């Protein structure tokens, strides 16, 4: 399984916990998850949960863990200047 060597939340390296969701490459500082110790056993990272509701996410910010279910995707993501990678409202689409 491939994972990034930098935290998806803050962008820096260090002690990172890795997502167990199939094919998810995301890794995170515990601090950046608002956790004080690694989750025990199989763990799915915050990218798989909708920002707006309790449903699983299906549409993803490519620059941070924000993501959205089918009911919340419209208008929550826009194609960025970086190869059309989708970004949430927290990034300048011209320089994500």
């Amino acid at each position: 399984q491939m994972h990034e060597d930098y935290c998806f939340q803050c962008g820096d390296g260090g002690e990172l916990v890795m997502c167990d969701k199939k094919d998810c490459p995301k890794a995170y500082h515990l601090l950046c998850l608002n956790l004080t110790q690694p989750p025990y056993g199989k763990w799915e990272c915050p990218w798989h949960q909708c920002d707006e509701c309790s449903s699983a996410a299906v549409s993803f910010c490519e620059f941070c863990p924000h993501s959205f279910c089918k009911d919340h995707e419209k208008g929550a993501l826009v194609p960025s200047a970086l190869e059309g990678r989708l970004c949430c409202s927290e990034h300048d689409p011209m320089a994500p």
Binding site: H3, G13, P38, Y40
Partner: peptide
């Protein structure tokens, strides 16, 4: 969950 230690920018 598994952890690793990488270089910190």
């Amino acid at each position: 969950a598994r952890t690793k230690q990488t270089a910190r920018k």
